Design a protein around this nucleic acid. Structure first.
Ligand SMILES: CO[C@@H]1[C@H](O)[C@@H](COP(=O)(O)OP(=O)(O)OP(=O)(O)O)O[C@H]1n1cnc2c(=O)[nH]c(N)nc21
Ligand SMILES: CO[C@@H]1[C@H](O)[C@@H](COP(=O)(O)OP(=O)(O)OP(=O)(O)O)O[C@H]1n1cnc2c(=O)[nH]c(N)nc21
Ligand SMILES: [Mg+2]
Ligand SMILES: [Mg+2]
Ligand SMILES: [Mg+2]
Ligand SMILES: [Mg+2]
Ligand SMILES: [Mg+2]
Ligand SMILES: [Mg+2]
Lengths: 538, 537
DNA sequence: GACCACGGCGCC
DNA sequence: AACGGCGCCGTGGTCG
DNA sequence: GACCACGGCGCC
DNA sequence: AACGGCGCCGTGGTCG
């Protein structure tokens, strides 16, 4: 059983943190295991120096803590990544242990032994799965090291700007509350959907257009209230109240309070085994959800700034998911869109709002994305008629004209579903896999739902795979140039570079991101440089 | 005609005293932009004014520049665009004739042609997004890699080769005498005509095969293999041929090609010379160095590292068969690799009737000819001669292979069916070869076309993967003070300081095996050594 | 005397 | 003729 | 008083 | 109910 620190080479580590967030956490305990022997370390933080890498469950999290402490301990093998690739419903160590063998305890030494066993166990289960193993070796494992740096680096925040914005927004919220009290007759909680329901539909008697998902009540969502906006001033004021209160409580007030003592920066987590499609997620806080669409949203992006002497470089794949679809489907009308430098989000927005291309504002573009992606990924005619404010039959027709325009897209969806029906899974271009049950369910609505999940995944997942390969390829070249990778927002990368090197960093990042794979459609990257995140995308 | 220097993004043209850039004199240099030709009065000094060589045969000029101590990387080259459009485009003369303009012997004209052919061929490649990706991400950056490789060269053990020439000369004389004695009279052993008359008329030996085009009785190793053990003269002639071949082609000429500026041997890596997407090597051909026979192994010993350095040799294991397993999805073939089997060894063992460990390189090579032969459509007739078995048993051998690997057969059929409809076949990355005669009326002409067509995606995919490995590996070698010397299709030869050689080997292995998500893992055999033989032991 | 199609064979 | 893809050597028939 | 399913909504 | 994929906020019904 037990031997003394330090462990031999190629040992698997286990550890306990005071809490989830590695940047904020205390390292309570550290152990390592090889050939079944558990070596416990009496001084956890100092014992980090003895390891060449962190190999084991949640390796990246430990590596992040190490970086915080000034130690470069890269993450290596992690059974969670093997498990996530085997089945992306594997998202936690508790779950993976339960499903495949052993138990996730709260003791470093047990965790270290589990890491070792689960590693060989999951490796064994992945035998013959050569494309999943390639993703492991060439994408997921090296990416974990990229994510560790990203987490430990963080992003600078303009604190004073945000404090001033809180005060400004508070004042607007008070004014809107009063104006809505006046308009309704009486005080109430504007943040209570139950009380808003009773006020809007009972007392004021306004038409109740939609239902809620699970409670079957009349909905107060922006969807259900959109048509009612211009007629009734109260509805406008409530939606404005909602936006301001959302942005204040979720972003404006909490974020400046999360500045970290050791760095003077804001730190997030990039969760590498959290989605069914192969995307990353971000949490604590979610820096993949920063507002950007509305006028107030744009002011929040202004608060994300570079270190003094540096600039932000923002690179966002243009119409990423649609380019990926063009490749997957081979639809040459869709391939043609890109070869001609057309933008279908702009084209749809122009039609929708009845304005030229140049007068398409970000709200409009986002609203057009919802139609373009909506129709493609199986939005009903009913919902599309409400969203475009057109008759049912004309919505039905709209849907059929899209697939008439893009017949190889339709054929691709059908092939994807037919295969998914026989195999029980769908997969990305690199062979990442998602199990989708219910493709042959008897209830139509449950089958059709399963279908939408299934033919979406290869597109969303292929795009994620391509971004991850870009990151793994780009990151080592950034370090050589004294540049940093701060954020990923799915099809977007945010970097930080010295003002001197920012032009060259932009050019290299663009090249790497656009040359990742021989697609039937060229990948194009929108680059911007700026002192803050808003101006870096102007 | 405006004055030197030219504006930025100009296309260059140049004239060399000769083919080989390492040996050539730069007679003239010009550059062109927007139709204006800027002629340089001092060619060699005018190289300093360019940021890159853009234009026809850009790599060749870049090599001359490197020789001169100037780092002028090659960029755009219409030859590469043309080669990707159709790999029958191999020369500037041909490309100009086919697509527009004329290849002259005047720098300024060549520079203007470069500009016009660039936009012309770019235009013709519109919509061909995978070919353009190969251009931007593989062929263009590779041209820079090849420039360094050419200008770096490889060290040669000159004294060793001189001693070997003397030793081989003596053997040649002895064998000639022993063959004169055995035949009755002198004659030219190097004359196939006189060997024919001596072997088949005078000595009356059976004449098993014909020559391709002259319809005479063949004196080839094929036609003489069965006759070896019975008749001592036939053995002696084959040995004579090997020694004279190796002496005249490698042993004597190579040490005389050591270059005054480097003290090394330099080759050319021709980037638009093959129908499949492979490189070729010429002047001399360092992709043809003997390896197989005992004497062949001694020649490899002559390829050595600089003092204080080691050679690193990396060769894709059963690379073409791994590529086929991916293309075909044949899971029996995928299984071979997952189990760490070697079908070349397996075939050789049964052919020669010896264990795995007693398979010598001659035997392995002979097994490769059977394994690849049968796959790529060798007739039963020829296979019966090569295995020395009855016709019917050769027929059966062929059918058992495709019974074992049914998705390979299905893959061949799909490849041919599509090639029939499109008139071309293509690699995994979309590199394309036009193959006429897939529907020819004469069976033999059709079948030939077929063999060319279903071979290409395999040979070409393998070439594409190697080129991507080179483009990815090369920049990382420079950071480590290492060099890339040679490519031999599925093989890379590097040179590194003895201290860094372990780390260079490990990085090169990683890069070469992680190039693409195949259904079969790519495995690289690595070796380190002072010479090329020992780096592969 | 100059040229080059050809057999033969080195490598993958 | 016909496994596929290259490049290099020495021979001797042909021609102006 | 503690918990958490839920509507709603920020982003891709 | 049903475009797909996430994570975060404040509300109020339920329960021991
Ligand atoms: C499946 O691909 C799409 C998008 O292409 C991808 C990236 O989002 P974003 O960058 O906002 O859209 P896109 O890149 O197409 O537009 P621009 O970056 O503005 O050119 O994210 C996916 N996505 C974004 N919003 C939605 C959405 O509402 N529905 C679905 N089904 N997918 C969406
Ligand atoms: C189409 O692929 C094959 C081979 O896989 C490839 C590489 O050659 P080499 O490295 O000698 O063979 P391989 O890599 O299969 O074996 P080892 O490296 O010895 O493991 O080169 C091709 N090749 C080699 N010799 C031949 C041959 O005689 N015929 C054909 N048709 N192809 C051949
Ligand atoms: Mg985008
Ligand atoms: Mg985006
Ligand atoms: Mg090989
Ligand atoms: Mg080889
Ligand atoms: Mg020939
Ligand atoms: Mg929810």
């Amino acid at each position: 059983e037990e031997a003394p620190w330090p462990p031999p080479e190629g040992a698997f580590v286990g550890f306990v943190l005071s809490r989830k967030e590695p940047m904020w956490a205390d390292l309570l305990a550290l152990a390592a295991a090889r050939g079944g022997r558990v070596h416990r370390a009496p001084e956890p933080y100092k014992a980090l120096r003895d390891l060449k890498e962190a190999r084991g469950l949640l390796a990246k999290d430990l590596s992040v803590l190490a970086l915080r402490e000034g130690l470069g301990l890269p993450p290596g093998d992690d059974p969670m990544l093997l498990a996530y690739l085997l089945d992306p419903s594997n998202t936690t160590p508790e779950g993976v242990a339960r499903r495949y063998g052993g138990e996730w305890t709260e003791e470093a030494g047990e965790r270290a032994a589990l890491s070792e066993r689960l590693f060989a166990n999951l490796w064994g289960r992945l035998e013959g799965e050569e494309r999943l193993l390639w993703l492991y070796r060439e994408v997921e494992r090296p990416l974990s090291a990229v994510l560790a740096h990203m987490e430990a680096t963080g992003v600078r925040l303009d604190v004073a700007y945000l404090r001033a914005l809180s005060l400004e927004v508070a004042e607007e919220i008070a004014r809107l509350e009063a104006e809505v009290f006046r308009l309704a007759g009486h005080p109430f909680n504007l943040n209570s959907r139950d009380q808003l329901e009773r006020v809007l539909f009972d007392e004021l008697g306004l038409p109740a257009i939609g239902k809620t998902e699970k409670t079957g009540k009349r909905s107060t969502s922006a969807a259900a209230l959109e048509a009612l906006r211009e007629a009734h001033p109260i509805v406008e004021k409530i939606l404005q109240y909602r936006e301001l209160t959302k942005l204040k409580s979720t972003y404006i007030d909490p974020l400046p309070d999360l500045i970290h003592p050791r760095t003077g920066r804001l730190h997030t987590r990039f969760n590498q085994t959290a989605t069914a499609t192969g995307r990353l997620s971000s949490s604590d806080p979610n820096l993949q959800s920063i507002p950007v669409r509305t006028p107030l949203g744009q002011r929040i992006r202004r608060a994300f700034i570079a270190e003094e002497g540096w600039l932000l470089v923002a690179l966002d794949y243009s119409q990423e998911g649609l380019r990926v679809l063009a490749h997957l489907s081979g639809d040459e009308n869709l391939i043609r869109v890109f070869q001609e430098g057309r933008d279908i989000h702009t084209e749809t927005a122009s039609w929708m709002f009845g304005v030229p291309r140049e007068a398409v504002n970000p709200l409009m573009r986002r609203a057009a994305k919802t139609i373009n992606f909506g129709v493609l990924y199986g939005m009903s005619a009913h919902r599309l008629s409400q969203k475009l404010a057109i008759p049912y039959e004309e919505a039905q027709a709209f849907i059929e004209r899209y697939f008439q325009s893009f017949p190889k897209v339709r054929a691709w969806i059908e092939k994807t579903l037919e295969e998914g029906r026989r195999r029980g899974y769908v997969e990305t271009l690199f062979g990442r896999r998602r199990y989708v049950p219910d493709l042959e369910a008897r209830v139509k609505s449950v089958r059709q739902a399963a279908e939408r999940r299934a033919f979406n995944m290869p597109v969303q997942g292929t795009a994620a795979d391509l971004m991850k390969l870009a990151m793994v390829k780009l990151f080592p070249r950034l370090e050589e140039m004294g540049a940093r990778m701060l954020l990923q927002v799915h099809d977007e990368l945010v970097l930080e570079a010295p003002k001197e090197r920012a032009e060259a960093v932009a050019r290299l990042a663009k090249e790497v991101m656009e040359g990742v794979y021989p697609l039937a459609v060229p990948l194009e990257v929108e680059v911007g440089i700026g002192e803050d995140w808003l101006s870096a995308k102007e």
